[PDB]
Amino acid sequence: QQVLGTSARPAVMPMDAWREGDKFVVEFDLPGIDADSLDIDNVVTVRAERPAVDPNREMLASERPRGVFSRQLVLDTARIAASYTEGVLKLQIPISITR
Amino acid sequence: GTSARPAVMPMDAWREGDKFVVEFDLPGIDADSLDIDIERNVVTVRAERPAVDPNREMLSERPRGVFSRQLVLGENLDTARIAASYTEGVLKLQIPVRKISITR
Amino acid sequence: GTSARPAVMPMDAWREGDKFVVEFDLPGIDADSLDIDIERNVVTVRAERPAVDPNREMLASERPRGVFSRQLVLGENLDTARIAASYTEGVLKLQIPVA
Amino acid sequence: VLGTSARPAVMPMDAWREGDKFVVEFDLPGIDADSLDIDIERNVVTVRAERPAVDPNREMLASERPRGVFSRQLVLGENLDTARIAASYTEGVLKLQIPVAEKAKPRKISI
Amino acid sequence: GTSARPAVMPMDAWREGDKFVVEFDLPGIDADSLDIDIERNVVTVRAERPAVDPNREMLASERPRGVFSRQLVLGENLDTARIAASYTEGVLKLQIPVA
Amino acid sequence: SARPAVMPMDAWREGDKFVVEFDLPGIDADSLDIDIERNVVTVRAERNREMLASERPRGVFSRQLVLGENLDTARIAASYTEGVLKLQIPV
Amino acid sequence: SARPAVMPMDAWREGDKFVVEFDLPGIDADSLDIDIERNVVTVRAERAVDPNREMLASERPRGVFSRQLVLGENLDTARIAASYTEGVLKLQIPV
Amino acid sequence: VLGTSARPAVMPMDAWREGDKFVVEFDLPGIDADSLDIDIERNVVTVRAERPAVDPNREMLASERPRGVFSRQLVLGENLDTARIAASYTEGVLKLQIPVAEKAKPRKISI
Amino acid sequence: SARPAVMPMDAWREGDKFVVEFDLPGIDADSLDIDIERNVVTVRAERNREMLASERPRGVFSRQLVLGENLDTARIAASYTEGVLKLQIPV
Amino acid sequence: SARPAVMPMDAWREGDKFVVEFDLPGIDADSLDIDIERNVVTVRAERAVDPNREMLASERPRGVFSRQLVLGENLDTARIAASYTEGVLKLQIPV
Amino acid sequence: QQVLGTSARPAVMPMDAWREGDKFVVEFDLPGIDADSLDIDNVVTVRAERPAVDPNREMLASERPRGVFSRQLVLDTARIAASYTEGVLKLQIPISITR
Amino acid sequence: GTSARPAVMPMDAWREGDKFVVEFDLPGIDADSLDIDIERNVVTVRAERPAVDPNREMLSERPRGVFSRQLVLGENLDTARIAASYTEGVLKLQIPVRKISITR
């Protein structure tokens, strides 16, 4: 808690990247992110913007990550299938010598 | 976190006029494991994220297991007309609802 | 600590006969920011201490400031009506009779 | 480290819910019943025990066992029967069994 | 903190025109234990807060107690004679004119 | 049993009898094993259900005691009462 | 295999051969696998004790050990020479 | 992290004593002289500089450089000449040279 | 030079020019070496006397920058002013 | 040599031979020395890079490695059998 | 600092043990220990007792180890030469197979 | 600790009537390295413990190197008649030597 991401200094996101029988799928945990201003633009960069809590509004519990969230991915980058379901950004991308 | 020793989940609890709202973050949760079974005293939210696919070894940074949270509040909120919503991997809970002398 | 994420405050609680005494430390607090919100059986103590100007150059900044809050879960033994509160020497002594 | 009456030290506990009996277990090895006091009403169940301290002048070889006042505050819901509580002390283990009084119709929340 | 090994106290120092102000936080302190010992150019602030009875059973012990001390090395700009000290709301505001 | 956890122990010299005390609350005597040979005493003990709390430590507990030549290792008295394993070895 | 442990390696540039050494103490060669991409070279190896064999002390790190080495374009990727001597995997890559 | 005017951040410094000149060095890369203020009397030498902050709305790729108010309080003995101090700023390095005014007869303590 | 320390750096995209800034105060230009080949930029710099204080970090400082295919690696501008190594690479 | 680093070892009791294994990746045998006392056995070995050979990355632990093993009286101290295979120093002590 | 040794729970002492051309000498750092009640009694145990500071006496600096100091040494134990000089307890005591 | 970056040494400074006493702990210190050279403003105590014998490798828990300590006090103590003693590895230093309104 109290660890947010400035627009200049963002916060990294969790993700599980695995290869199935013939797919290369990454899954980024992205809950409560409804802003279509999130930009998943050699490398694939995933960016999202979750709003910040009002300091004047007195909430008795403020324990959740908010702000700017980003993650760069060094890796066919043309036909990728992105799907947002249940708050999960699912991105689907396609020696025996010795001495 | 296992069932015996559960892990804590994030939440934000704020009072919004007529409705007190507390929101948990449970992304990609299957409903067969999400259970908030409790009585009138407290409000316990339990949920289970499945372990990694045993046949699918990956190159694994997302937390999984059992996440639980106990909310101890007063007798004010009516526990009968509670409203729950699971949207965008968010568990939004909406529960509806003198002074003392100028200190010496 | 801001109003969203408050910083806790110290307190000493002891049962003195038929008078359960709690003691909070609030040195130098204006009464307009002090708010003792009480509900069914929980006593919520909130107070606001002003913040330092970031541009004002002070040689030492060691005193904690901001929003200080503390929730008190009380059993059904103390009467939430009759209560006596005092503020002496920057001390918030609350006194709740019991049964 | 060491728990005093004003600042008590926490004690280990294992709590599990049997079908008919809700069980809590506290680890209190070598405790005298004269100091062991489960004094509380039917609201919050607080276990307070006291283990005597060591003489600062006595010269022991190894002082590794924790001593002093141990206390644990347990907040229970409205499901446990308060009067018919059972308590036992076996092999330095304080086993407490509390029956559960469940309601006829439970609540299932819609989403 | 005991008298041999004292625990430090918070303070805020700022130069207000010809009045250098220091502010110590001493909530609930009896004046018989407060001792402001001054020497050549060093201002030593000492205060004693009583300790809790170890045998008295209190449900919460969170407030720091014992001997609180603080040494202040001051330059040759402030007059060590004319000084004005106040204790309001558990606050020890010392005010030393300058040159 | 490969990586054991350590157990608390208070030892003092009571005149003719040197006494060591271990805290083993709620231990089955079938698992309590005290293996000693020559001048070293080895104390070994052994102790997903949606539990409300699981604060008590469990598993294999062990303690390795290197003793001097001042105590007779053959005549050693041991008792287990109130969850305490008290061992007294004369001088 | 999913979450591997890192290996100790040291790389120095010989006059004509850049040499990187890995510490692989007692890894069965059937588990040793050197999979190299275009300009990166990944060294993987597997080395766990069976629970029915009760050990008095287990301190050696076991499991999956891996390392992903990002190399420059100045090294030829075809004629690399590896050896496994005294539990050291000596990789010698010419230039 | 970030130093403000009320809570300033410390700055690195290397101080060594030459035979004739006592030298102190501060690391202030990319500092504007309008904010750099060595304002103090002949008692304690305090170096106070200010580096502008970053716009919270501007989207940078990496924000790793420390910014804000940097301050350093230096307590010196009665050996340094106060008036004839030399100050320079070269390659983001604040080099300060202060002559030393030693006494004729020094003290050697007996034990 | 085997185990180098990392240096601070602020990078941002200024329209046609992507600018990265390193803090190298009081560095000799003979030791400042910027080795770059293909799409990776490597920045390397090098910086008992009874001193009163030795708070300034010294030794070998290095930084490894992995860049994308969006910038031309041949035409890169560099400057060293006020102890700051500013490198601007066009898009 | 004065302050040595510890070694990873694992010991298990075979049916008739208690075996303890050490990880010694690429230690020249001239520096390997096994000095055993009455009932204790001390394994010492030496493995440092020269400064004139500039390395791009140095991560392998080097220097003096040692281990003092306190054994019981149930092991015969005369007919021990040691091997150094795949950088593993396998000590086999009968009973 | 503030780390002392109870008579029951003592504090360990530093020592340098080395073998010369024909000696086995251990050197224990023991400054300001003048009590002859210090007892250096298969194993050699070194014990010493340094007095404790008075809590009532207000000292402005109390940063040094005091109290009970002990150290056990597992090792001809008959003719040993002990010497205390400059606050230093100097104790002087006298396979090529593979596969 | 080296000469550039020295290590701190323990001490106890208490006011004993006519004499203010501050004691340092320097066990087994050779006098050729112990030097407390300072002026009237502060009191700086420096001492150097020799590094381990290069020809004598041991099986080394005693700290060595350069230990220094700076004592900043007021102008009260007379810096002329200071008394120093080195006994039992202890450096005992003996230096000889209005109110304000009841706070509002």
Distance CA L88, CA L93 (A): 14
The alpha carbon of residue F27 is apart from the nearest alpha carbon of chain J, in Å, by 27
Instruction: Work out the burial of residue E54: count CB atoms within 10 Å of its CB; fewer than 13 is exposed, 13-18 middle, 19 or more buried.
Output: middle
- Taking CB atoms and an 8 Å limit, are G9 and J60 in contact across chains? yes
Distance CA B93, CA B102 (A): 36
E strand or H helix that includes residue K34? none
Distance CA F82, CA F25 (A): 7
Tokens coding E98: 């300058």
Burial F26-62 (b: 16+ CB within 10 A, else e): bbeeeebeeebeeeebebbbbbeeebbbbbbeeeebb
End-to-end CA distance of chain H: give it in Å, rounded.
Answer: 47
CB D5 within 8 A of CB E54: yes
Structurally, how many domains does chain E consist of?
1
DSSP A45-91: EEEEEEPPPPSSS--S--BS--EEEEEEEE---SS-EEEEETTEEEE
Q: Which of B76, B59, B67 is nearest to B29 (CA)?
A: B67
Distance CA L11, CA L23 (A): 5
Strands (E), chain I: 5-6, 9-14, 17-23, 33-37, 40-46, 53-54, 60-66, 77-81, 84-90
Chain F residues within an 8 Å CB radius of J74: 37
| Cβ–Cβ contact K22 with E under 8 A | no
- Taking CB atoms and an 8 Å limit, are K97 and J85 in contact across chains? no
The alpha carbon of residue C5 is apart from the nearest alpha carbon of chain E, in Å, by 20
Tokens coding C83: 């209560």
CB pairs under 8 A, 24+ apart, for L29-37?
L29/K86, L29/L86, L29/L89, L29/L91, L31/L86, L34/L86, L34/L91, L36/H109, L36/L84, L36/L93, L37/H106
Q: J18 to each of J37, J90, J93, K4, K69, how far by Cα in Å?
A: 18, 11, 5, 44, 40
| Cβ–Cβ contact E99 with C under 8 A | no
- The coordinates were experimentally obtained by X-ray
- Taking CB atoms and an 8 Å limit, are B76 and C39 in contact across chains? yes
CB L30 within 8 A of CB L100: no
Strands (E), chain J: 5-6, 9-13, 17-23, 33-36, 40-46, 55-58, 64-70, 81-85, 88-94
| Cβ–Cβ contact C63 with H under 8 A | no
Chain I residues within an 8 Å CB radius of G74: 37
DSSP B37-66: ---SSEEEEEEEEPPPPTT------S--EE
Burial L82-98 (b: 16+ CB within 10 A, else e): beeebebbbbbbbbeee
Distance CA B76, CA C40 (A): 6
List the chains bordering chain L where 3 or more Cβ pairs fall under 8 Å: E, H, I, J, K
Q: Scanning every residue of chain H, which has its alpha carbon at the shortest distance from the alpha carbon of E99?
A: H41
| Cβ–Cβ contact L87 with H under 8 A | no
Burial C6-17 (b: 16+ CB within 10 A, else e): beebbbbbbeee
CB G43 within 8 A of CB G69: yes
CB J93 within 8 A of CB J71: yes
E strand or H helix that includes residue H12? none
| Cβ–Cβ contact D33 with K under 8 A | no
**With left for phi above 0 and alpha for psi between -120 and 50, is residue F16 left, alpha or beta?**
alpha
The alpha carbon of residue G20 is apart from the nearest alpha carbon of chain F, in Å, by 35
Which of E53, E55, E57 to mutate to test binding with chain D, by most D CBs within 10 Å of its CB?
E57
| Partners of residue D31 on adjacent β-strands | none
- Taking CB atoms and an 8 Å limit, are H43 and E76 in contact across chains? yes
| Cβ–Cβ contact C99 with D under 8 A | no
Distance CA B8, CA L92 (A): 56
- Taking CB atoms and an 8 Å limit, are G84 and A99 in contact across chains? yes
| Partners of residue L47 on adjacent β-strands | L67
- HEC string of chain E equals CCCCCCEECCEEEEEECCEEEEEEECCCCCCCCCEEEECCCEEEEEEEECCCCCCCCCCEECCCCEEEEEEEECCCCCCCCCCEEEEECCEEEEEEECC
Q: Which of B39, B80, B84 sits opposite D110 (nearest CB)?
A: B84
Chain B residues within an 8 Å CB radius of C84: 101
Q: Scanning every residue of chain G, which has its alpha carbon at the shortest distance from the alpha carbon of I36?
A: G72
Q: Scanning every residue of chain K, which has its alpha carbon at the shortest distance from the alpha carbon of E70?
A: K60
CB K9 within 8 A of CB K71: no
Which of L3, L33, L67 to mutate to test binding with chain I, by most I CBs within 10 Å of its CB?
L3
Residue J52 CB partners (closer than 8 Å, separation 6+): none
| Cβ–Cβ contact A37 with H under 8 A | no
Resolution expressed in Å:
3.8
| Cβ–Cβ contact H56 with A under 8 A | yes
Strands (E), F1-91: 5-6, 9-14, 17-23, 33-37, 40-46, 53-54, 60-66, 77-81, 84-90
Q: Give the three-state DSSP class for K68.
A: strand
Chain C residues within an 8 Å CB radius of A59: 3-4
What's the one-letter identity of residue F8? P
Q: Give the three-state DSSP class for H13.
A: strand
User: In the structure, do chain B and chain A come into contact, i.e. share 3 or more CB pairs under 8 Å?
Assistant: yes
| Cβ–Cβ contact C21 with B under 8 A | no
Q: Give the three-state DSSP class for K52.
A: coil
CB A31 within 8 A of CB B90: yes
Distance CA G89, CA G26 (A): 11
Query: Count of B–C CB contacts within 8 Å?
Result: 30
Residue L26 main-chain phi, psi, to 5 deg: -135, 80
- HEC string of D16-55 equals EECCCEEEEEEECCCCCCCCCECCCCCCEEEEEEEECCCC
Chain H residues within an 8 Å CB radius of C53: 5-6
| Partners of residue G84 on adjacent β-strands | G89
- L74 CB-side CA count, 13 A: 18
Chain A residues within an 8 Å CB radius of C43: none
Q: Which of I76, I70, I80, I71 is nearest to I88 (CA)?
A: I76
Q: Which of D61, G72, L23, I1 is nearest to F66 (CA)?
A: D61
Q: Give the three-state DSSP class for J5.
A: strand
Q: Which residues have a C–N gap over 2.5 Å right after them in chain C?
A: none
- Taking CB atoms and an 8 Å limit, are D75 and C76 in contact across chains? no
- J44 CB-side CA count, 13 A: 13
The alpha carbon of residue F44 is apart from the nearest alpha carbon of chain G, in Å, by 12
**Total length of chain D:** 111
Tokens coding F25: 């609350």
Q: Scanning every residue of chain F, which has its alpha carbon at the shortest distance from the alpha carbon of B1?
A: F48
Tokens coding L60: 């080394």
Distance CA L28, CA G77 (A): 62
Taking residue K89's Cβ as centre, other Cβ atoms within 10 Å add up to 23
DSSP L19-44: EEEEEEE-TT--TTT-B----SSEEE
Q: Which of F42, F90, F81 is nearest to F62 (CA)?
A: F42
| Partners of residue A28 on adjacent β-strands | A15, A89
**With left for phi above 0 and alpha for psi between -120 and 50, is residue D18 left, alpha or beta?**
beta
Q: Scanning every residue of chain A, which has its alpha carbon at the shortest distance from the alpha carbon of G86?
A: A99
User: In the structure, do chain C and chain L come into contact, i.e. share 3 or more CB pairs under 8 Å?
Assistant: no
Distance CA G58, CA G75 (A): 40
Chain L residues within an 8 Å CB radius of I49: 3-4
- Taking CB atoms and an 8 Å limit, are I38 and G72 in contact across chains? yes
CB G45 within 8 A of CB G30: no
The alpha carbon of residue E75 is apart from the nearest alpha carbon of chain C, in Å, by 14
End-to-end CA distance of chain L: give it in Å, rounded.
Answer: 49
Distance CA F80, CA F86 (A): 6
Q: Which of K75, L95, K72, I70 is nearest to D62 (CA)?
A: K72
DSSP G15-84: SSEEEEEEE-TT--TTT-EEEE-SSEEEEEEE----TTS-EEEE-S--SEEEEEEE--TTS-SSS-EEEE
Instruction: Work out the burial of residue B32: count CB atoms within 10 Å of its CB; fewer than 13 is exposed, 13-18 middle, 19 or more buried.
Output: exposed
Domain around K19: 1-99
Chain C residues within an 8 Å CB radius of B40: none
Q: How many Å is the Cα radius of gyration of chain F?
A: 15
Q: Which residue has the tokens 């004499």?
A: L19
Distance CA K52, CA E2 (A): 13
| Cβ–Cβ contact F35 with G under 8 A | no
For strands E7-8 and E66-73, give the pairing.
Answer: parallel
Q: Which of J1, J39, J45, J51 is nearest to J23 (CA)?
A: J45
Chain B residues within an 8 Å CB radius of F52: none
Burial D65-95 (b: 16+ CB within 10 A, else e): bebbbbbbebebeebeeeeeeeeebebbbbb
The alpha carbon of residue J83 is apart from the nearest alpha carbon of chain K, in Å, by 4
Chain A residues within an 8 Å CB radius of B27: 29-31, 86-88
Distance CA E71, CA E83 (A): 16
Q: Which of B36, B80, B42 is nearest to D79 (CA)?
A: B42
Instruction: Work out the burial of residue H83: count CB atoms within 10 Å of its CB; fewer than 13 is exposed, 13-18 middle, 19 or more buried.
Output: exposed
List the chains bordering chain B where 3 or more Cβ pairs fall under 8 Å: A, C, D, F, G
The alpha carbon of residue B66 is apart from the nearest alpha carbon of chain F, in Å, by 10
- Taking CB atoms and an 8 Å limit, are I51 and L3 in contact across chains? yes
List the chains bordering chain F where 3 or more Cβ pairs fall under 8 Å: B, D, G, J, K
Distance CA I10, CA I19 (A): 8
Distance CA E12, CA E25 (A): 9
CB J1 within 8 A of CB J68: no
Residue B54 CB partners (closer than 8 Å, separation 6+): none
What's the one-letter identity of residue K18? W
The alpha carbon of residue J66 is apart from the nearest alpha carbon of chain F, in Å, by 21
Q: Which residue has the tokens 């696998």?
A: G33
Q: Give the three-state DSSP class for H7.
A: coil
The alpha carbon of residue E88 is apart from the nearest alpha carbon of chain L, in Å, by 7
Chain J residues within an 8 Å CB radius of K99: 81-85
Q: Which of G87, I76, B10 is nearest to A65 (CA)?
A: B10
Residue C52 DSSP code: P
CB C13 within 8 A of CB E60: yes
Tokens coding E56: 């008295």
Tokens coding H48: 């106070």
CB D69 within 8 A of CB F17: no
Tokens coding D12: 């280990």
Which of K3, K58, K62 to mutate to test binding with chain E, by most E CBs within 10 Å of its CB?
K58
